[PDB]
Design a protein around this ligand. Sequence first.
Ligand SMILES: [Mg+2]
Ligand SMILES: [Mg+2]
Ligand SMILES: [Zn+2]
Lengths: 39, 94, 16, 1114, 222, 104, 263, 83
Amino acid sequence: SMARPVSIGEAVGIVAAQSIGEPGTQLTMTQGLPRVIEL
Amino acid sequence: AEPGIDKLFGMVDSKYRLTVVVAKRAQQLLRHGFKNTVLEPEERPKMQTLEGLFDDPNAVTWAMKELLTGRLVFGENLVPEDRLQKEMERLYPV
Amino acid sequence: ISTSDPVRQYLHEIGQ
Amino acid sequence: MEIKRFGRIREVIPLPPLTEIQVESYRRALQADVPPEKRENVGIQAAFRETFPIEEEGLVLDFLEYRLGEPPFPQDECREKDLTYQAPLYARLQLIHKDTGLIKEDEVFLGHIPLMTEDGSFIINGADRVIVSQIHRSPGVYFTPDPARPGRYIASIIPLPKRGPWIDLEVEPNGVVSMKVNKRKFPLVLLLRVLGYDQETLARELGAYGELVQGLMDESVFAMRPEEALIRLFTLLRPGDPPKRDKAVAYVYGLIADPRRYDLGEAGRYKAEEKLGIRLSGRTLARFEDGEFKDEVFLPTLRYLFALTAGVPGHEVDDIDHLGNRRIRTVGELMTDQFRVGLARLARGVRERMLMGSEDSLTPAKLVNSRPLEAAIREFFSRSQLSQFKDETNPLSSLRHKRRISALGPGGLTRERAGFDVRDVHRTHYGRICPVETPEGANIGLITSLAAYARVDELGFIRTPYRRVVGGVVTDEVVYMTATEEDRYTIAQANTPLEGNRIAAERVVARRKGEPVIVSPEEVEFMDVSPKQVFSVNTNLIPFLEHDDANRALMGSNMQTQAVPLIRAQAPVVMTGLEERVVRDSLAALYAEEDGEVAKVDGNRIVVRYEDGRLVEYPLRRFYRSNQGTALDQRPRVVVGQRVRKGDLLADGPASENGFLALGQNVLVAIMPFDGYNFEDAIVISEELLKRDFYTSIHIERYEIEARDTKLGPERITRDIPHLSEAALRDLDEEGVVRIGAEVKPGDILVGRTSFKGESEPTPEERLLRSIFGEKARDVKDTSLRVPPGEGGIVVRTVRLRRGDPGVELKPGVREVVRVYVAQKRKLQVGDKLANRHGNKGVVAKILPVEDMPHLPDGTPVDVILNPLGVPSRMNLGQILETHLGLAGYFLGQRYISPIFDGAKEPEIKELLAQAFEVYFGKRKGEGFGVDKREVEVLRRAEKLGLVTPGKTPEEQLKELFLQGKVVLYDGRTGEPIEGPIVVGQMFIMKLYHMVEDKMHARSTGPYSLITQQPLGGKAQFGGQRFGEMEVWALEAYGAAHTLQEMLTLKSDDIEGRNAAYEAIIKGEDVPEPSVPESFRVLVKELQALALDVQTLDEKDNPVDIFEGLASKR
Amino acid sequence: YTGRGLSFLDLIQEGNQGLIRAVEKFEYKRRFKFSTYATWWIRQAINRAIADQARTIRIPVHMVETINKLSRTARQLQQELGREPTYEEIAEAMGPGWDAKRVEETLKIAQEPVSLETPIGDEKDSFYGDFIPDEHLPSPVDAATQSLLSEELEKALSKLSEREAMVLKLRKGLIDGREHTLEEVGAFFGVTRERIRQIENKALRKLKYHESRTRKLRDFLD
Amino acid sequence: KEVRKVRIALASPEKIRSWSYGEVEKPETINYRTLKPERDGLFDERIFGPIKDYECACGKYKRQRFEGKVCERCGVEVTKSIVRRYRMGHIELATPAAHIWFVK
Amino acid sequence: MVQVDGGRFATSDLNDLYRRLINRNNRLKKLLAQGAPEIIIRNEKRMLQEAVDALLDNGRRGAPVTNPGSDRPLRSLTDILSGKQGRFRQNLLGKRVDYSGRSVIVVGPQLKLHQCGLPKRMALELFKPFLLKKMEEKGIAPNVKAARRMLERQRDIKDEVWDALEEVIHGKVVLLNRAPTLHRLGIQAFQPVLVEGQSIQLHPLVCEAFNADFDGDQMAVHVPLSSFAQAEARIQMLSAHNLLSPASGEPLAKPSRDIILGL
Amino acid sequence: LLMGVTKSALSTKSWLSAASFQNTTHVLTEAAIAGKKDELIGLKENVILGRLIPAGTGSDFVRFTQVVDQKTLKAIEEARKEA
DNA sequence: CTTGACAAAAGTGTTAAATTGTGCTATACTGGGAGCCGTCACGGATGC
DNA sequence: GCATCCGTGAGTAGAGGAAGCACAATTTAACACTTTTGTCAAG
Ligand SMILES: [Mg+2]
Ligand SMILES: [Mg+2]
Ligand SMILES: [Zn+2]
């Protein structure tokens, strides 16, 4: 979000989960969202 | 965006340290009634009121502008907490 | 009789 | 304003009564008008003949006839007094002493049967309600293939819901056919023996297929007598019960042979006979006669199963989603089912009451306790899933709700356990269920709407009309036929050209079992009546439907229900032809019964002198509040002395103009971006709409208060409220209620009420306060009803019901109840939601003055500005064609009727635009005005874009733009023209029920929860906004640790924190550091109630008391 | 006896207690079979258990039998009159000593409490507990104005004399929490009963004069 | 001191009886007429605390002066009413009963 | 067991579960004292065991326990602490908050990237404790209680109350929220601008991050209170400070449908 | 060893986070018997207790930062080092 | 201001009375009533 | 392997929401009656 080295103390785990799960509604749905879920 | 936000972020190693310094400075300003400010009378933030131009009551705005000047020293274990509060009370009665 | 049915279990017990 | 009608298809039959699904079904169930001795064995008459006679096994309680009396109160009285519009039910029963041989007859009061209003709805507890028809799997015998093992089929026998167990016949791999009842599998060989079947009988009938019969020839139990085989079967089904012949025969009889417990149903019996090719004597799996079991359906079911597995040509599997296999339970069947269940409970109570207490001197009145019957009926009409609050925002809203089909409800599917197959459009929905109309989201495909021409038959199967085609000519003979019957014919399309009645096209587009095919005129056997039968009433109101994507046509039809009535509502310029029929069948307007003359016209009533001479006075519903708060009023449309014919309109109903459905306004629409105020579906409107009172609606809000009895004393509804000035009590009359006609704002008192204060000594500071001022504390406190924030208007009605009033059944402890009706006239404002019939919706984001809106060269400003970017992604091109047709009709002063899929085409729209240009620009030439300089510039830019042919005169180029629906549009701010021609026309826009006035809410502090001490939820309760898990995740990702902590503790449930934070803020200080939430304290105590020692520790593992020493025993 | 508030097994166990009592009091000298006499005790036990354990808010037997009798009379009138009877008709049929008020009070008493977890609507996300505010704990506004009143009262009492402020804070119970009496206040300062009510009145009068001059305390009176 | 760790563990019968301020011996909740909680019931003031701050059941002590005191006439401790959210009781089972969590 | 707005009583399902356990426990004590036979005692002990199980976890073993007169299972301790409607997910991981509002959103093109259109009536209620202090500071009201009483009635609010309101919100920011909050930019800090009306004005450039169009969306407004909360919102959560997507690093507040078309 | 997100989250060292996710009966049963102690390391546990989450401004790296101006800092240092 | 009165609010028994808890009823009666498939589908753990 | 059991399935908002009696035992309201408090003079 800033194009600079990550600041110490950022909850990157929550950001990681939100980043992956945000476009989930855009998946086509072994292909699409079910493929992601099993992976 | 907040004025001088790029300069504010570059003065700290972590963006959350900047927020802590600004928030702590704002309460120091609020606790002593803005009498411990490092801003000269021509540098005090102002707001436009119907009566006229008056001092900004938002201490966060004051704290951000004070940090831009560079007259504030921030860091860890600068002074003891109890010694800091008592000395500020003595120099700035409230 | 039925372990999961207490009423049927009681009726079996009194039937002895 | 003449109406030009497009279309070439000649509809041979009109639309059936749109509410006949609700009205005719309930009439058949009640049968209140047919004489008792001519009543057929259907409806609640079938319920009486089924449960009765009740036999003690020598007392017999026989049923002879029933009748329904007049309702105790009229419909208006029930609504005003919160009553149920119902009719008392009396049954004529006779008690037969089989010992003595004496009959005593009397009429017993079985309770109250709720009555259906003429429009097709019910008044339950003073509220209008609609019973939604339910779709489910039709009962009968079905043969589905086994998915686990290919080439195998399973026989399923389904009775009526809650009328017997499902019967599963499956060929096991071992070869023996198994039967599953109540999750218990057992060999069908045993039960087949129980019904008197030998070894040679089975081989003589089922032995002509192959190895299948050999699996049904187990001789170990064939020689076994039916009696012990019945006992052996009885032990298998329920193990543990002592084996007794009398108990065993009763259980088997009750399982498959008892009409009172097992009911295949009229639809189920008909399907079983039609599928298996047999003739059921009754509606049960077996008949129990002469002390022995005789087979009805197991052998024909098993015969079909064996033949289907063998592979004979005449046997096929059944599609359970096929609409011939799915039936509709209307209000009549649902009410009868609940009536039958309640009657069974009454029958059980009678049976157990007639076995004790003065056996000789018993009367049918004493034995019959009618409370279980009334309770079951009351439960169905109040707390059923299919008994829904009537949606009456506008007459179309109520009309749709009655024609809705729901797969949910008691006995149907589940909202979350429903797969894609039950939610999908089957091929048999063509002409019977609308494909596009459905609630998008979690209810998509589960709630559907009946088609316009579709009707439900006696058995519950939806039928659709088709025109008989013989020898290539299309006749006027219309056949209503079900999906299973429809699959046997080649049905053409309604758009096939006809030269009179003979089919002219050599290649006819037809359907064979739902598949599109191309056939010759001589291969056509049936034809569609019209394109309107495929869609519902709501979808049929969308002009140019063929140019709209289905996903957006779904939104357009659904939003037509949400349109509010307007005080100046106008029928759309472009219509489809159902606008008159929707109003006529909604019973919202008033029509003349026969030819006559109007004697008296008034805003309150109309008196018409009919030809026969009788004077009929029709009271007019005026400013009535609907279930959604909208004002439903009827405005007279006749004058004194006017001659009216039969069916002539007398008074418009809500949202109707001269008998035509008017859900919105016809406004001049310009399709162009405007300074970002059109951004992302936002809508720009002119201030001229507000000046002439367009999109202005009247909404009525109801406020209720009750004066209760309390231990300390009775609450008094009075004008004398303690500690209030005269300004607060200015609008209250001497009775304490606000006067009618007073304007009320938030915080204003609607009715003054005082309640006795609970006995409690005051705080010492208050005692000193009263001591200083010398004021004695009173015994009553202000508990009056005030206007909630964001509400108000004009008090138009005050309803005061007092204890003991005739028909007012106030709850115990309530002396009186006062209802205040506050009506406000809402104008269109920023944030209000506008929409059209083509799925284009948006909120008004800007209201511009008349001098800022773009205007035509003649000086006419546009009313609404639409963003063109919303068209390409949604693919709803019908609004563009409506805009083009509206532009042509705006300057020609005419309206149009373009039926869906057969209406105005572009050549017909363009020929109208050519005439509209001759009055648009030809008038300018007559006035002595040439071509504008600004117009010349736009034409120069337009010819660079290829919109006009180069080399033509400016007038000819302007005509070319006009034929495309585009005009030279000027900017009201700069005066310079828009650099390109803009599509400007007249479009019908509706104002939806969703308004920002009823959705804005804010709260600083308010009511808190009981256990968790967290703020409540909802605007009505003045609650806070739910900060759920995802919101907490957002703060965690941002790193806002202190912002999150405040919301978790300071602003939600930190009782010490929130009290100190509010106190600190009002003192001008910063809020203090928060503490442990009360919810965590609740969690700890609830964990301790589970015998779990949850202890909060410190850095040194020592216990830390978070309860402040209030939970530690000394 | 099923469907009257107690489960089937609860009815059996209560009847078992009656059966045990029947055995203790049974006499075989009368030549009557056991089932004839045991049926009384078993039915008595089941009915008493229903009258004592079928309601969350327990109602005595005498009032329960009154409620049951009231329901029976209402049903008989309802089936005879073809409509729900009014309180006057129910009271008249009940007998002497019964009026519409007593019938209404008994019906109000016979109201079972409603569960806090009963859902409303098809959506299983709303219950009664979500719509019932907590009116016991003071609101943040109520706690604030109480603190505002306390700080303004202690400031107003400063203008008083050292003893006069003490007397009012002691006579109005601002110190120990409880209101004291003139004799009790007298023991604190060694002063007689009569003198204190005069200095208490005089101190009260001075506060009235100060408030009338400043009006910084009227708003808290509501 | 600040909370740093949260420990969950089994509660012994001795510990459960240590949490409880009194045994609930009757299923009565409140008096149906006076609406006051019944003695020894699920809402007994003698076990879980007073309904209102600094006031016993019998109405003899009604102020904060007698804080931390138990009235001899009624048995209700004169303290804050918020203790009714934090004070637990216990039921002495005639026979032991297994905890369903550690079974199913 | 609380009396409600009227006169009737409302009680939780735990009281019913507790009552049955006490009724069965007391009856077992009586049965044991009477020397009842083993079958009666065994049945009572089994019923006592089931009563404990229903209280701790209803429906886990056997048929769920239902209130007579209805088929709804009683809510046990396990049901209270578990599920989407349990204590954790409904009251601990998420809560309802004070100083929170909600209204329909409309597009504001004249707003800056860090600004939002907050209605006056919403801001009056949201910033009420701050407003009451400000009115006390000026001559609008004598004290806080008089100020609050003045704001109770709409017709009793003078024109100087609004003037104090803008002084209150000067520099402060509010959090705009649209559900579902799929990513972290579903909540953003904006500087409120008092506007006439009832709808929130949303900047066009933040629509994509919020996934918010103007066909009838609604948003939640939250007011951070202290200096720590204001500093976090103004520095970290400000809309003009979050311009790049944390998922990919590409710009998230960028020109959109009408802006791209015009350029 | 490889496990899914559900199994990995349910087998975490903190019972408070695991109980609030899924298998509340199972997680609490195992934690109570084992006498598990939650050190409150992640974000969910602090949210449940209403504490300051150990991320962002609540992280130990930046939480203890002190701000002071020239005049007070010199006054504190001068009045202390003078001894 | 201490002293002596006086009218009224409050604490203290006393008792007829509503109000509540307990016991008992003797022809003989002796193992329940309700339900019932678009049963929801898919992993995952444990048993055997 | 193969059954069997068990837990899971987006987020805000809205509007709509059938015994009866006798008799002893334990509260409870009414009634006096006596302190016990508030009060009002002697100058
Ligand atoms: Mg929807
Ligand atoms: Mg949207
Ligand atoms: Zn006491």
